[PDB]
Each structure stands twice: as structure tokens, then as C-alpha cells.
Design a protein around this motif. Structure first.
Motif, PDB file in Angstrom:
ATOM      1  N   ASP A 275      -8.291  -5.434   1.124  1.00 10.66           N
ATOM      2  CA  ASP A 275      -7.680  -4.857   2.140  1.00 10.66           C
ATOM      3  C   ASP A 275      -6.556  -3.881   1.926  1.00 10.66           C
ATOM      4  O   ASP A 275      -5.817  -3.398   2.591  1.00 10.66           O
ATOM      5  CB  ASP A 275      -7.266  -6.124   2.959  1.00 10.66           C
TER       6      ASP A 275
ATOM      7  N   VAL B   3      -8.317  -0.318   2.279  1.00 15.58           N
ATOM      8  CA  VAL B   3      -8.501  -0.073   3.806  1.00 15.58           C
ATOM      9  C   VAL B   3      -6.824   0.597   4.081  1.00 15.58           C
ATOM     10  O   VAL B   3      -6.850   1.691   4.851  1.00 15.58           O
ATOM     11  CB  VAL B   3      -8.649  -1.178   4.778  1.00 15.58           C
TER      12      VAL B   3
ATOM     13  N   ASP C  41      -5.720   5.283   4.202  1.00 10.40           N
ATOM     14  CA  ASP C  41      -5.364   5.407   5.557  1.00 10.40           C
ATOM     15  C   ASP C  41      -3.877   6.175   5.434  1.00 10.40           C
ATOM     16  O   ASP C  41      -3.594   7.273   6.368  1.00 10.40           O
ATOM     17  CB  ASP C  41      -5.157   3.941   6.546  1.00 10.40           C
ATOM     18  CG  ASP C  41      -6.122   3.963   7.353  1.00 10.40           C
ATOM     19  OD1 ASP C  41      -7.170   4.581   7.410  1.00 10.40           O
ATOM     20  OD2 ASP C  41      -6.131   2.806   8.123  1.00 10.40           O
TER      21      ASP C  41
ATOM     22  N   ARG D  20     -12.719   8.787   7.601  1.00  7.55           N
ATOM     23  CA  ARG D  20     -12.533   7.479   7.294  1.00  7.55           C
ATOM     24  C   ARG D  20     -13.949   6.730   7.562  1.00  7.55           C
ATOM     25  O   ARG D  20     -13.979   5.805   6.622  1.00  7.55           O
ATOM     26  CB  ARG D  20     -11.588   6.873   8.418  1.00  7.55           C
ATOM     27  CG  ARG D  20     -11.068   5.505   8.124  1.00  7.55           C
ATOM     28  CD  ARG D  20     -10.063   4.967   9.139  1.00  7.55           C
ATOM     29  NE  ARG D  20      -9.426   3.861   8.704  1.00  7.55           N
ATOM     30  CZ  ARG D  20      -9.790   2.554   9.017  1.00  7.55           C
ATOM     31  NH1 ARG D  20     -11.070   2.465   9.532  1.00  7.55           N
ATOM     32  NH2 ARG D  20      -8.840   1.674   8.689  1.00  7.55           N
TER      33      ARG D  20
ATOM     34  N   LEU E 247     -15.054   5.103   3.734  1.00  7.57           N
ATOM     35  CA  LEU E 247     -15.290   3.618   3.781  1.00  7.57           C
ATOM     36  C   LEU E 247     -16.691   2.942   3.219  1.00  7.57           C
ATOM     37  O   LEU E 247     -16.868   1.737   3.504  1.00  7.57           O
ATOM     38  CB  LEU E 247     -14.774   3.088   4.935  1.00  7.57           C
ATOM     39  CG  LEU E 247     -13.281   2.842   5.294  1.00  7.57           C
ATOM     40  CD1 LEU E 247     -13.127   1.849   6.272  1.00  7.57           C
ATOM     41  CD2 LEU E 247     -12.275   2.584   4.114  1.00  7.57           C
TER      42      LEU E 247
END
Lengths: 526, 527, 527
Positions: free
Chosen positions: A2, A5, A9, C20, C24
Motif C-alpha cells: 500500500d 499506491v 500518487d 493512474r 496500477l
């Protein structure tokens, strides 16, 4: 993960902020910011066959000094990692202080300042093995004979074809000891008769006026001539000099506009955000004009303004540097605005006068704008503006050539073309022109054409140049004399108090009067 | 000396500006008094202009059933519509001789077939037809034009906007033989109302075939319409290229100062097509490549490229400049011209020029031409200008190429000739070739680099647009046309008299080997 | 145009979202490759979080015997306890210089006196004290902090839960002059154990008194604690108002689209108190109203209200936005500032500002300020922003008031300016004023109506809570603080140099009549 993620970002968050600042017309901007956001290897030896054919020894005098340990030695390290030093290179740090543990000295005094880059750091230990420490006087012939023997030792052991050895002497010293070091080398540690050249790099200041500079040149010339002597200016990059010379001289388009009938003004700018940083006392003797303008900016001017060299050989370029400088009139006080910085708003830079090592009532300029007049066919009536400033709004070095406007027929739908050669804070070279926008011809856009296609940095470029024997970017004796004759009357006027520096706040552009001076001497803002 | 000519113009212009600055504060005699004294020292987004949507507009396409109008003019108006450059109250009337019953089936079967199918425009087709009417008439009966006049006024008085009257663009998609009568007809009774409205008339090529023929037409039309109203159209001259020529140079000191004998080695303007003429000897054989695109298309490009500096961007100022430079051109000589005619492709897919029923057997008509022009003025004397046009060659290309003189010293073979290219086909592109340093470190280690100077209706469409906007720049003026014809007619005569002959070249090749020898023998050096 | 700016941001954000969505599923170079390719197309109920009750926590209140700590910090921690937002194993250590014997009598006589007496909390007082320790030390001896470190580890290893180590919030209820040494002290030997635990440090105002002074402190602290750890606290900025500012706008198209130059006529942020300063010239006179609440409190409110759209609700994204908009603010000018100083109330119950032993006679220090800020960006250019703060005025009020431009057409005087009010004091309230129809029947028969947009620890308490939760939103970041100081310092200098002067106003009035004239002359229209 995590924390996958998360990090992407943050990447996106940075891209976002880039595009919203610049506001491109966006896919391609993201593309070329992703690649700028990226941007145990063996050293492949890129050295010529003449360089590997003989032993090389580099002797840095003043080795434990701030210049040598923070700048010279790290530079030599970078050159080593880049394969630009011969494989069997010998480097000797010569200084006056006895050292119990030379290996400690190497780690603590030098390695500390080596680039902590991954692809550099893992060569450091290999580099130190090429370095020795040597303790001696700067004026005792016997110490240089003892040095000579230490060197012959390494030379005569060279695992290679030619005998003798090449010797580069780097004088990271005050100018006051140069004559004695040079004399000591002449008598005590010149290369072996069997073979090798002697070159000597000397650091500024080269005097502080015509007279003192000439005295110093006369004091050195009986020992080393202008093929041996290398007056280094750390800031003059190879890359900017190729910009100045090739862009112009190889091209009809740029050759043809490089003159009085097409150029409105030329400005050479040197800007830093740093102040004197506690060392005001030293700077107070020198001032901004002697520090970077009479030397660095003037060499830039020379190269920019010279007539065409008979060839691209170094001494032909230097002849032309000399000739154009000879056409420049001595700068008058009326063509000079001075500044002295006060404290920055956040106090990170204390005012120049707040420094305890600066004497009360100091009038020393940390900032200067001035105008030079080149009296020849090519340049008559063209204002050349030199600008240098400490503790101003950004770090920046560039040439800005502004061409004459075409009033008719576009009128206010056009503006003056510019050619910009920037070296700091990164290299760029580009022309501003007006182009059409994709009904009316009156609808136009100012656009920038990039002309510019881990290389060594400017300082490293010069040391490499001295190792290869390329004199181009070094001020020759006669060139130097002429440069002092441009500035010395002004310096006399300034030292007699006829011009007073205007206080400016550190972090600002400088005195408003300096900008008005630029705008009054042929520059238009638009 | 080259710098002093430009300086003299810039001085004169500067003196006129200070007169202008004075004489805009309170008469010829104030010029003379100030002279002595100066010495002593998706949805169509409407992009249209306010004036445009302020009065009514009727576009009348005469000859509306002809190939040109239905396959080109109406589809071109359709694109202007889609691009939001027609006023929203635009009236469009196709005029033609055949009487028609179902007006709506004509719009669909004669016009719509040829509109753009592209999905960005598909949506708008039916929208655009609401603006179109049909009118049946002849081109000489004063009666019919009085009838048309009444129909136009009908639509004009119905306009829901401030200014009265109505602007009228008459588009003569017609054979030139009828231009004179249609124009007289419009004069006699279909001009715009007295209250208000401009009139403009677009006429179509050919504009004669020589000095004599062209001047007859000009004399024929000039009783009825002046040069602020007449618009001789060239389908192939695009806005984008014209601006590249004018702006890039005249807005910029860098280019302006090098645009001359002292800096330029040679200049070529090239128009090349892979297509041939098959089944159109019906027009081509009488015309030839020189009259087709060189006298008219290439020469306007030349004029724009070679002209002296206009005092402003006002259209007639630019046109004045086109005329002056054209007047400096020597009539082309047969000694400075290489002709070609194409035969069948090696592969045998494209048939030769003579292999066509509609082409006189034994025809000597050139499908290819390379020629050298001499511009005798201070700016251009001695500079080779090469015009090249050819059908059925290797590629579809249209470009200006300017080759500048070498700086031999001091880079030698580490540099070469700078160039500037302005390309329009097969796509827009404008670049300079220059020599730069490479990083990583000898001064003579150099690269060639092409700088891109670059920062939508097509060529034809943008000309119709300029005419609606009342901009004459890219249209050949009467005087301009005459001079161009005088440059080409003597050569065209020597050609008709057989004094030089076309060389055969297989379709799909560059053209005659002699043409390239000619070029290289006229100052151009291959990169 | 205003719609296109927002659209440009929303496009960019949409492009980043599809990157994104791709990146991912299996590196910077995948951004560039995807970029080109996208172009082609009662009982304390524990409310605490799992992580919170998962590792040990020690809150160290330094300066625990000082007024701030005993009268504010500890009672605030007490309320968080009562509201079930302290972890149940919470350790709390008051640190201070005085040596103490009966630790339990200190908790009761120095701390408990000041806890909340309210009957909903009375019950819990003794419960909360079981969690509190005392520690006697200095703020510079490395020794004492090694001693503290051992005491903390004692309590930490005793924790009856899964994760080892312990989280530590250091609360410096101290004069700023000691922040640097205490921080160095904690660095040298009282940081959390290597095994685990975050460290966070709450520091108290003043954060300097100008650009220079504030940046010294920042440089002083930054060697030891970074911006993810430092928490510069503003007692008066409440969660409830911050959410009203951010959510109401950014979650809603209706408000977001009107939050700009094109729609807003003027914006005022107001902080008003009836209380004066009596007997506190000791702090106030050196500080003044501008540094007290305007540079710090009003400006953070402004930043949150004026900022551009953050890509997410991540705290540092919001803070990035606060900084960018603050950078667009012009330094306040003396031409845009009206100052006041209060005198005795008409009734003679409240004494004037100078009528105080602790206030330099003749003091020129402002107790009142109204000023206009200019935000120079696409969103705000030309929009008046008015900040107002005043002590000893008519009422206790804190509110944002946004006044929107009139729709003059077609309702005229049957409508007026919409407004949006976000009030925090004397109570929370958020409403829009709009004009509605009345039933029973002309279109121009209209009413004003206030729509209520409304659908617990106090401001201070909720900031301590956010810091425990590791949320920086409502805390001023280092860069943010610097920019704010640069907006106010030049005006503060002109004030200290006497270049503008305070107008007297009787305690209990609105303030100087000139202030209201100023407001009305800066775009605001009275309803």
C-alpha cells in the motif's frame, strides 16, 4: 504494498503541479517531465594515446586549503571517474603543515568533499591510491628538489613507452607566493631533460589593476611562457564557448546579423543568490568588478565580440580576443551603477555591513552594472552591458543579444528578436522570434527555438583542457594587460569615492537605478 | 551596402511616422512645413466578426450545377459553415440554367453527395442546406437578374439585425467566356441596395492564356467592378504558407537582414504531383504546365517571397509590393527553361501523356518545367530563382527552399550551407538547417540540425474566407496579373513556335535528367 | 474563460487518473509511453482508531506548571479523554522545573482546579488523573532527557498490546525562546525507540513577529524535526469551519463554479471580540492586533477559502494549495489599511487601552484593523478581500461573508446580491441568502430567504486530536508561514515607523467610522 499506491500518487502530484504552473497546450509535457524526473561500473579510459604514452604528475600546491580540497581535488576525482586522467596518473598534494597520518589526511581532508554519487563514490578508494601528501615550503629550492626526487621515483617506474614525465603544477595559492613557487619549480623540479612538458595553473586574482597585474606577469615570465602558463577562470565552460563560436561562425544566418546594423544591445549577466558568507573581509579588498567582471565577464565579451579567427587553433582565438579588447574604451564612472546588499527579508543572508569582518563605512560594491563601448566597425554604437551581482534574486549566467526591432510592417505585432546563451542555472541557447499563429497576419506569437542539441562541468573542462594543452579559454598575458586597461580608471574613480553603491535588499534584483540604466542604454523590456 | 538600402527604407518609414505623429494633431502643406523642421535637429462555435453578423449576407454561386461548384465550391462553403465562419443568417443561392422542380432533392443529389462525410461534419449537413436556395436563370437576361434582385431583397429585408441592406458575394463558378455578361448583368440590376452593402465578385481561372488574352478580360470586367471588388482566385495558395513567407521574414530582424543577394545563394519554388492528366487533355493540352500553375500559382508565391518591405500589412500595400518586384523580373528566356512530357511508368501502371483519346496525337505540350528567373534589383541581382513544376513525378511536394551562402571560413567542411524550407505539401513544415556544436570536445565536431519554426479550413476555403472578410492579399490584382503575363508570354510564344522541345520522362521519375543538371548548374549545391 | 481554467485543471486531473488506472497494473518511463498513446484517440465510549490502540502513546506536556498548560492544554486533553478519543493506555507526563513531592496533590491543585466542572465530565476527573505522571527537569540538560527517555520506555514496554515501541507527542507549552534547545534535547536522547513509533512536536505561538524572526525559529528547529513532525498550532481554527470551507465548495459543482472573480463581488473575514486587553499589555502591546490574529488566524482561513483545487484531500496536497495562493497575494500596503485603538466605553465600565499599568503611556498599538488584500491570479484578480479584526467592539463574531455580484437583469430591485456566510462565533452557522418567489401572483413579488447548509471537542481540542491522528491540514507549514509573514511584514514596518496611525474608538462601538467607509469603498453593499 500500500506504499506503491502512495509513491506513484506523489509522482502524479508533482506532474500535476508542473503542468498547472507552466500550463502547456499536456500529454507531451507530462511525457518530457517524466523523463526529466528520471534524467559498480568499471572506468573506461577515454584518454588519447599521447596521454597514456608518458607518465603524468599533477602537483596541487595549497592542498589542505579550501580551494584545493573543496574544488580542485573533487574536480580531479570527477575527471578520474570519467576516464579523462591517464591510468597511471600521479597526484601530489603539497602543503606546509606536517601530517602524521597521510591516509587519514586523504580521507578527512579530501574524500569528505568527493561527490557522494553512487556511480562516483565507489571509485574513491581507488582514487586515493593515486594521491600522495608532500610537506614543504613554497620558497625553498631544496624542498622542490626533494619533491623532484619523489616524482622522478614514480616517473622512472612508469609502465609505458616514453621516458621522463609530464608535470602539471596547480597553484591553489594566494598570488603573493606565485613568483617564489615558480622560481622554486624552475630551479628544483622541472621535468626530466629526457622528456615531458611543464604546465602551471595559477588562480585569481591576477593583480588588482594594470600596474600590479603587469608586475606579476613580469615576475613569472622568466620561468614560464604563455605556452606553459594557464590563468584559470573557473566559470568559463567549454559548452558556452562552443555556443558563442560555432553558432555564429559556422552559419551565414548568425554571422550576418552579428554586428552594429542588426544588434540593439548585448548584456552579459552573472547572478548569485549567495552573499559573501562571513568572508566579507576578503571580498572587501576586491569588490565585484575585480572579482568576476574584469576577468570572467570580459573573457565572455571578448569571445562574443571578436573578429573571425584565422583558424580554430587556440592562439588564433586568443589573438582575436586581444584585438577586440584593444578596441574597448576605458569604462567611465557615468556608465557604472554600483550596489551593496542589505539583509534579506528572512535574514538568511545578513547584510554585507552586518559582517563583523567588514570594516565600518565600507563602500565595497557587491553589485555592478556598467556599459562598455567597443570602438570598431563591427560594434560602434552598440551598448555592451556587463552585470554582476551577489545576493540577488536567482543564480543565473547568460548572454542576451537583443536585435533591432522591425517597426514596419508588424508594428506592435512584433518585438525585438533575442539570442540567449545561458550557462546557469542550466545550459540553454535559443532565439526568440515572432511567428504566425495557426486569419490575420497581425495575429502573432513570440516563440523560442531551442538551438541546443554526465559530461564534465565548467571547472573540470578547464583542467582537462590544460592537460590536453588547449589554451583557448585561458587569459593570455597580453589579453590580461588590455583587460586591466579597460577597468583600472573606473576602479581608481571608485576607490576615490566618486561613485557610491546604492543599498539593495538581498534576494531582490538589485538597485532600481541599475534596471533603469539598462533600459536607458538600448534595452527594451516587452 | 545591403545594410544601407534596408536602412534607407527604415529611415524613410521613420520620417513618415513622425509626420504621422504630428499630422494626427490638427492638409498637404503641413507635411512640407514639418519636413523642413524635422530636417533642422459537435457544435459549430461562431467565430465570425461583429460587422459580419451585423448586416445581411447573400453568397450567389452562379453555375451551381457545374462540376467546380458542386464538387468544390459548395463543399468548401460547407466546411466554412462547420468551422463557424459563415454568419448565422447566411443566405446562399445556387444559380443555374436548368429549371428544377424539387429544390430539396437537388440540394441532396447534386450538392450533398459531395459534402464532407467525416463524422465531425456529417452531423451538420442538413443544417447547412436550410441556408441554400435554388434559382433558375440565364447569364445575360437583365430580366432574370431583376428577378434575382427581388429574391435577394426578400431574404435581406427579413434579416433580424441592426444595419439595413445586405452584402453580396457573387461567385462565378463559370467558364471565363461568360464573365463579362454576368458582370454587366449584375451591374444593370442586382447590385446591393443603396442603403448599404458591399459587393464582391470571385472569378475563376484561367485568367487568359497570355498578355493579350488576359488584358481583354480585364478591360471587359473593369467597366463594372474595380480592384477593391474583383477577386481572382487561386485555389492552391493557402493562408498558412503566405503567413510563413511574410511574418517569418518581416516581423524578425534575423531573417529580414539575410533576405538578399549578399546572403542567399539560390532559391527554388517547387510544385510536384504524382498524378498525371489522364482523361483531361480536354483542358490541359491547350494550357500546359507553365500556364496551369507557374504563371499564376508559383509566381504569386515568388512575388510574396521576393517583395520589398511594405509599410504596413494593409492588403493593397502588400499588393503594391508584389507588383513592384514582379516588374523587376526579366522575361523568362528559352535559354533558361527545361521542359518535360511524361510517358508511361516503367511499371506500366500509369499511361503516358499522349496515350489518351483527349490528347492530340504528337502533342508537344509540357507536363514538366524547370526555369531560372532573374530579378534585377538591388536586393536580388545575380541570385538564381528556380521555379519547378511537374505532373506524374516521384512525390507530391510543394515547398520553398532558400539556400544561403557557405561560411567557408573558419569551419570549412565542418560546416555547410544553411537552408530555410517552407513546405505546404504533403504537409505544412517550416525549418532552418544550421550547424551546431555537439557536447563531448573539439570545436570542429559539429552536427546539422533542423530548427522547427512552426508554432482548420484548407487553402481554397481560407481564400473564400478572406474574400468574405474583404482581404485581397492572396488575390492577384489587375496590374499584378498583367506583369506576370509579360514575364511568361514571350517564353510561351517561343514554346508554341517549337523553338524548344519537351524531353520525355517516365511517369514516376523525378523528370528529365537534364532538369537536375540545369538546377545544379544554376547555383544549387546538394546537401 | 473562467469555465476553461477549471476545465483545464479537471482535464489534467482526468489524464493523471487514466495514467493512474494503467500504471496500477504493472516506473517513470511508463508515464511517457502512456502519455503519447492517450493523445492518439455517563461512560466514555472509545471512538479511537485501530492503529491508535495498537501501539503505546506518551503525550509529554513540557512546561506543565505554566498558565497555558494547566488552564488550557490539560483541560483540553481532559475533554478528549471524556469524548473517548485518547487511546485507553494513554500516558501523559507533565514536565517542569520545580521539584515536587506529593505528585497527587499537584494533579489536584495545579491541574484539576481547571478541569471542566460540567456534570457530564465531573465523573471522569479522577479517572483521567490515573494516566498523568509528573517529571522534574530542565529544558537543556541532555541528562534529564535520557532520564525521561528511561521513564517513557518504562511505561512503553508495559503496554499490553501488539506492536512494540511507542508513539510520542511532545507538547511544548513553553516560551518560543526555549523551543530550539528542548528540540535538540529530544533529538539527542528522547526520540521514540528504533523498533517503532512516530514523533510529533506541537509548538505554540508566537511564531516570530516578522519574516526575519520567524525564519530564524524555522532554521533553528528544522535540523531536528521536519514538516511531517512539526505542528505549529493555532488555538482558534476549528475543524467545523475548515470543513465548511473545503467541503461545501469543493464537493459541490454549484458552489465550485461560482467561487471566482466572475461571480464574487467581495469577501470579508471578520474576527470580533467584546473583550479588551486589560492587564495584558504585557503581551499585547509588543504584538498588536495584526500579528495577534490576522497574520496567523485570519490568513489561514483566507488561504483555505481562496486556494485552487487540490488533487486530493491528503493533508500536504491541501497545504501545497494554501502556499500557492498565499504566494499570489500582494504585500499589504499602508494605503489599504485602517487602524484603531480603543478608549474607555461611553458608559465608562470598560477602561481604555492606554489606561493600564502594563501598557507604555502614549502607545500607538492597534487593537483594531481593517485591510484590503489583492490576490493576483486568474481566479481572484480584482476581487476585494477584506480582513477585519478588533478588540473591545460591539459583539463577539467570527465569520466569512461572501457577497456575489447582482443579477440586475431582469428582476432589478426585486432581487439583490446573493451571499454566503460561514460563521463560527458566537455559534456555528452557514447559510446562503437568495431571492425566491412568494406564493399568491406577479413574477416580481419576491422574498429574501436564508438557506441553512448545516446538517463535540472545541477548536483547540480538535487540533490536538488531528495531531494525534497525524493530520497537518489546519497547521501552518514552514513555507506557508514564511509567505504569510512576507505578506504582512512590510505593512508592519510602516506601522512601527509611524507612517499610519490608529484612530480612537470607544470600547463597545463597531470601531472607527473610517473603517466602515473603507469597507463600503471596497466593493461591499449593505443589505
Amino acid at each position: 504494498q500500500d506504499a506503491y499506491v502512495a509513491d506513484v500518487d506523489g509522482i502524479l502530484d508533482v506532474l500535476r503541479a508542473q503542468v498547472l504552473e507552466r500550463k502547456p497546450d499536456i500529454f507531451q509535457f507530462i511525457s518530457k517531465s517524466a523523463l526529466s524526473l528520471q534524467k559498480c561500473d568499471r572506468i573506461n579510459c577515454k584518454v588519447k594515446d599521447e596521454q597514456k604514452s608518458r607518465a603524468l604528475t599533477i602537483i596541487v600546491f595549497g592542498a589542505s586549503g579550501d580551494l584545493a580540497k573543496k574544488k580542485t581535488f573533487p574536480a580531479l576525482f570527477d575527471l578520474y571517474c570519467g576516464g579523462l586522467l591517464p591510468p597511471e596518473v600521479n597526484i601530489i598534494g603539497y602543503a606546509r603543515t606536517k601530517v602524521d597520518d597521510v591516509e587519514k589526511w586523504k580521507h578527512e581532508t579530501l574524500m569528505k568533499y568527493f561527490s557522494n554519487l553512487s556511480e562516483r563514490g565507489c571509485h574513491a578508494e581507488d582514487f586515493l591510491k593515486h594521491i600522495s601528501y608532500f610537506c614543504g615550503a613554497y620558497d625553498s629550492v631544496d624542498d622542490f628538489k626533494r619533491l623532484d626526487a619523489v616524482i622522478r621515483e614514480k616517473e622512472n617506474a612508469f609502465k609505458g613507452p616514453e621516458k621522463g614525465g609530464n608535470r602539471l603544477f596547480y597553484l591553489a595559492l594566494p598570488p603573493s607566493v606565485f613568483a617564489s613557487v615558480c622560481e622554486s619549480i624552475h630551479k628544483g623540479a622541472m621535468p626530466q631533460e629526457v622528456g615531458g612538458w611543464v604546465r602551471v595553473i595559477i588562480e585569481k586574482p591576477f593583480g588588482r589593476d594594470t600596474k600590479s597585474s603587469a608586475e606579476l606577469s613580469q615576475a613569472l615570465e622568466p620561468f614560464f611562457d604563455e605556452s606553459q602558463l594557464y590563468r584559470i577562470d573557473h566559470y568559463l565552460g567549454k559548452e558556452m564557448v562552443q555556443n558563442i563560436i560555432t553558432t555564429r561562425f559556422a552559419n551565414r544566418i548568425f554571422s550576418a546579423v552579428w554586428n552594429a546594423s542588426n544588434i540593439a544591445c548585448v548584456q552579459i549577466t552573472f547572478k548569485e543568490t549567495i552573499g559573501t558568507e562571513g568572508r566579507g573581509g576578503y571580498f572587501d579588498s576586491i569588490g565585484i568588478i575585480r572579482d568576476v567582471m574584469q576577468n570572467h565577464l570580459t573573457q565572455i565579451l571578448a569571445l562574443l565580440a571578436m573578429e573571425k579567427p584565422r583558424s580554430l587553433d587556440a592562439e588564433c582565438i586568443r589573438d582575436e580576443k586581444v584585438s577586440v579588447l584593444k578596441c574597448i574604451e576605458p569604462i567611465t564612472k557615468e556608465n557604472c551603477v554600483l550596489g551593496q546588499y542589505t539583509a534579506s527579508a528572512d535574514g538568511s543572508i545578513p547584510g554585507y555591513l552586518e559582517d563583523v569582518t567588514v570594516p565600518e563605512g565600507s563602500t565595497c560594491p557587491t553589485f555592478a552594472v556598467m556599459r562598455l563601448n567597443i570602438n570598431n566597425d563591427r560594434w560602434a554604437g552598440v551598448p555592451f552591458i556587463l552585470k554582476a551581482g551577489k545576493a540577488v534574486e536567482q543564480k543565473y549566467v547568460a548572454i542576451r543579444i537583443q536585435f533591432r526591432d522591425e517597426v514596419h510592417p508588424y508594428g506592435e505585432a512584433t518585438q525585438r528578436n533575442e539570442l540567449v546563451i545561458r550557462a546557469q542555472p542550466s545550459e540553454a541557447m535559443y532565439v526568440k522570434i515572432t511567428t504566425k499563429v495557426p486569419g490575420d497576419l497581425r495575429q502573432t506569437h513570440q516563440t523560442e527555438l531551442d538551438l541546443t542539441y554526465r559530461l564534465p562541468d565548467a571547472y573540470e573542462s578547464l583542467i582537462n583542457d590544460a592537460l590536453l594543452g588547449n589554451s583557448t579559454n585561458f587569459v593570455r598575458k597580453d589579453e590580461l594587460d588590455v583587460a586591466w586597461r579597460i577597468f583600472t580608471p573606473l576602479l581608481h574613480q571608485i576607490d576615490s569615492g566618486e561613485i557610491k553603491p546604492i543599498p539593495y535588499q538581498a534576494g531582490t534584483r538589485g538597485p532600481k537605478e541599475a534596471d533603469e540604466f539598462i533600459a536607458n542604454n538600448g534595452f527594451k523590456h516587452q
